[PDB]
Structure formats: C-alpha cells, structure tokens
Amino acid sequence: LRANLLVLLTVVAVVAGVALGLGVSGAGGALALGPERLSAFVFPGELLLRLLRMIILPLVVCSLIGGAASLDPGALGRLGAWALLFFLVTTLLASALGVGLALALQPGAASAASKEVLDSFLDLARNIFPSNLVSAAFRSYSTTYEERRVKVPVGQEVEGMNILGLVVFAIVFGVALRKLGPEGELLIRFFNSFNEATMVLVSWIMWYAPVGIMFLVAGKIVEMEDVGLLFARLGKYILCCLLGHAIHGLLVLPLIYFLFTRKNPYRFLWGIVTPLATAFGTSSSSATLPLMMKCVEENNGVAKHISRFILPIGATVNMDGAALFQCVAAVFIAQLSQQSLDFVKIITILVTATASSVGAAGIPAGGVLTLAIILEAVNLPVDHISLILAVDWLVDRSCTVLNVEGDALGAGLLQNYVD
C-alpha cells in the first residue's frame, strides 16, 4: 500500500532526523558548520514549511466555503455546535490533566532559578472579523503600547496569516452561497474545483514531507545545543508537559474516540502518522493542516464535507496541547514562587487556559504569548516565563502533535454522528 510506504518513510525520517542531528551536533555542532552551512543544512526543512504554508490559504478558504455550502444551515449549525462542544470538553480535559500531573509530580520543587488580558481578547475579536480580506491573507491585527505613565493600546496589522478571520469569513460566505440557491451553485462548483485542484498539490508536497521532516528535526536539535543542561533544571517540567501530552494523546483522546465510535482509535491514528510527524517537525498546526486533511479524507473513512469543515476550524480553535502546556507552566511557576493553589485558583487556571488556547495563533512559539495572560489572571510572577522559553522549542512541538491529533479524532467522532 502506498499509504504504508509513506508512513514508513515518515517514521524513518524522524528516526534519521534525530540520528543526523545528534551526529552533526556531536561531531562538530553548529560552530563547525557555521552560518554559511547551517542555513543550507536546515533549508530542506524550511522548504517544507514554505510549501505547506503556501497552500493553507487556498485550502482553508475553498474547503470551508464548499463545506459550509454543502450543508443545510440548520445541519451545519448542529455539526458546528457538536464540534465546539467536543473542542471545549477535550481542551478542559487537557487543562485538568496538566494541572493534575503538575500538582502530583510538582516540577517546581527545587526552586534553583506583554499584552493585557483585555487587549488580547479584543485582538481576537478584531482578528475574527478582519477589516480587509486581502490583508488578512498575510497579516493579523496586534496591539502594541505607547507612553502618553499611562499605557495607551495602539493597534496595527503585523505579519502573520489571519487564519481565524479567513475561517470565519469562508464559513459565512459558504452559508451565503447556500442561501443563494441556484445562482450560488456556480461559485460552489468553483471553490470545490479549486479545493480539489489544491488537494492535488498536497499529494505532491506530501511525498516531500519525509525529506523536509528529516532536515527540520535535525536542524532544531543542532541549533538547540546544551540540551543536557536544559534537562537538568527543567527536566521535571518537560516530563510533566510531555507525559501530559502522551497521556492525553494516547490514552484520553483515543478512549473518547473509542467510547462514541466503537472502532479502533489507534488505527485512526496510524492513518494520520505523517501529519502528526509533520506537526512535530514544523511545530505549527496551520502548516500541517493540509496534510491532516489529506490523510483524514483518504487514509481514514471520514467524509469529505466533515473533514473539510471540522479540521480547518479545529486547527485554530481546538488546541489541546496548548492548554495542557499552559496549565503545567502555570502550576510550575506557582510552585517555584512557593504559592499555594486552592480550588478556586485551580478552576480559573482551567478556564483561562481553555480561553487562551482558542486565541493561540497555531504558529511556532505561539503558545507562550498567552501564558502571561493566565499568570496575571491567577496573580503569579511573570519573570519565570524566561525559563519556559528555554525549553519551549521542544514543548511546543509536543503541543502541535496534540493540537492536530484532537482535530482528526474529532472529525472521526463527528463522522459517526452524521452516519
């Protein structure tokens, strides 16, 4: 089977990427290569990110317009409501698991060591309703601060695709096409044909993923040297985050899939091995979304309309890894500052992490910007975030795997709901 060969190549790519990275790091390291050779060494991994990011805009817009126009607005609303409930519950479970493991293992035992909450949510609302569709294709609204000793929040569009705004518009535009009737049928055919043509490009970029993944993980563990020192002071915090992702991604999420759909959940996860490893390599849910939608449609039996609707929405809203990581970091920082957390402080940590996970941009290093929001809500020192940045390169990659895995299993869950 061609799917099995792709999975075998992807598995070898991750193994070879780790082996190549340690070998390069061990033998000469980044210093021996130098900037002239380091840029070329990681370039094949960068090429995969560029190819994946180039097709996000045509895939997200056309799939959601076609997906929303292929269902009755009442049926689409029910499917969306069920998807949001699954996203909220799983994010809550990830948040609860992260706090529970952090309280149990206590990573902050040996204490050997931004944007406001309102402005963050106002930026989310501004990004949900973009002021320009063309600008939203490569820019997002962000809020900065100016001294006028009172901080005045001034806003302007920064580089970075506004996927959430494009997701919202495409769904609304798709509903408008459905309500148009016969006159909007031509546009439904156009976006479906455009979506199908883009999927042909995905199948070609799909075969380059093992080559890109190998050089993407090899370059990361080469440029991030002194790993042993990192695993010596934050080894327990990394364990809490990675074990929480493993427990939620291999025990909790598969069990939820098994309970509703009485099918093997790890057979579903085997079909999406390539996007999961791509998510690990790229550390972005947006770039691996093209491959996830490719595997979910063909490798698994998920319907075309379900996959093309739930996955683009989940790639921006459903982030189980971000919520678990933020909850562990919030408790870890609290333990470092010797702050005791009672039931009320735990509850607001769960709620704030769930809300902040929805606002996370789904981009590399994009989950630590919302970590400060949780800290101020629960009143913990923010200076300890610098520790999180040291190991974020590894934790974020684990988050991305969990961020997209819930989206795929959610598509499988909602597949049986329609059936």
Ligand X SMILES: NC(=O)CC[C@H](N)C(=O)O
Residues that bind ligand X (CB under 6 A): 283-285, 319, 321-322, 325, 360, 362-364, 366-367, 396, 399-400, 403
Tell the smallest beta-carbon distance from residue 324 to ligand X (Å).
Answer: 9
4 known ligand binder: no
In the set 64, 83, 87, 300, which binds Na ion (CB under 5 A)? 87
DSSP code string of 101-142: HHHHH-TTSS------HHHHHHHHHHHHS-S-HHHHTTEEEE
Pick what 90 binds: ligand X, Na ion, none; C-beta below 5 to 8 Å, kind-dependent.
Na ion
318 known ligand binder: yes
Q: Is 301 helix (H, G, I), strand (E, B) or coil?
A: coil
Pick what 325 binds: Na ion, ligand X, none; C-beta below 5 to 8 Å, kind-dependent.
ligand X
Residue 53 or 236 with smaller CB distance to ligand X: 53
Is 403 one of the binding residues for Na ion (CB under 5 A)? yes
Q: How far apart are CA 288 and CA 280, in angstroms?
A: 9
Residues with Cβ within 8 Å of 358's Cβ and at least 6 positions away in sequence, in order, are: 91, 124, 316, 317, 319
Are the C-beta atoms of 143 and 34 separated by less than 8 Å? no
Residue 283 or 299 with smaller CB distance to ligand X: 283
Pick what 320 binds: ligand X, Na ion, none; C-beta below 5 to 8 Å, kind-dependent.
Na ion
Q: Which amino acid is at 7?
A: V
Residue 20 or 94 with smaller CB distance to ligand X: 94
132-191: contacts with Na ion (CB under 5 A): none
The residue at minimum Cβ distance from ligand X is 367
Residue 20 or 101 with smaller CB distance to ligand X: 101
Residues with Cβ within 8 Å of 140's Cβ and at least 6 positions away in sequence, in order, are: 127, 157, 158, 160, 161, 162, 165, 361
Is 319 one of the binding residues for Na ion (CB under 5 A)? yes
Beta bridge partners of 147: 151
Residue 286 or 335 with smaller CB distance to Na ion: 286
Please state the length of the chain. 419
Is 274 one of the binding residues for Na ion (CB under 5 A)? no
Tell the smallest beta-carbon distance from residue 291 to Na ion (Å).
Answer: 13
Is 280 one of the binding residues for Na ion (CB under 5 A)? no
Tell me the window of 173-181, 278-286, 388-396, 411-419 that interacts with Na ion (CB under 5 A): 278-286
In the set 195, 274, 285, 356, which binds Na ion (CB under 5 A)? 285
Pick what 396 binds: ligand X, Na ion, none; C-beta below 5 to 8 Å, kind-dependent.
ligand X
Beta bridge partners of 157: 141
Pick what 373 binds: ligand X, Na ion, none; C-beta below 5 to 8 Å, kind-dependent.
none
Are the C-beta atoms of 281 and 45 separated by less than 8 Å? yes
Q: How far apart are CA 364 and CA 359, in angstroms?
A: 14
Q: Is 72 helix (H, G, I), strand (E, B) or coil?
A: coil
Tell the smallest beta-carbon distance from residue 405 to Na ion (Å).
Answer: 9
Residue 320 or 392 with smaller CB distance to Na ion: 320
359-378: contacts with Na ion (CB under 5 A): 360
Pick what 141 binds: Na ion, ligand X, none; C-beta below 5 to 8 Å, kind-dependent.
none
Tell the smallest beta-carbon distance from residue 283 to ligand X (Å).
Answer: 5
Distance, first Cα to last Cα, the chain: 27
Tell the smallest beta-carbon distance from residue 145 to ligand X (Å).
Answer: 23
Mutual angle of helices 35-54 and 185-223, in 10-degree steps: 160
403 known ligand binder: yes
Q: How far apart are CA 327 and CA 225, in angstroms?
A: 27
* Long-range contacts of 349-355, Cβ-Cβ distance < 8 Å, separation of 24 or more: 349/95, 349/99, 349/374, 349/378, 350/92, 350/95, 350/96, 350/99, 352/377, 352/378, 353/91, 353/95, 353/98, 353/322, 353/323, 353/326, 353/327, 354/88, 354/91, 354/92, 354/95, 354/323, 355/121
Closest CA to 139 of 129, 154, 150, 127: 127
Annotated binding-site residue numbers for Na(+): 314, 316, 318, 403, 407
| Site for Na ion, rule CB under 5 A | 87, 90-91, 285, 314-315, 318-320, 360, 403, 407
Return binding residues: 314, 316, 318, 403, 407
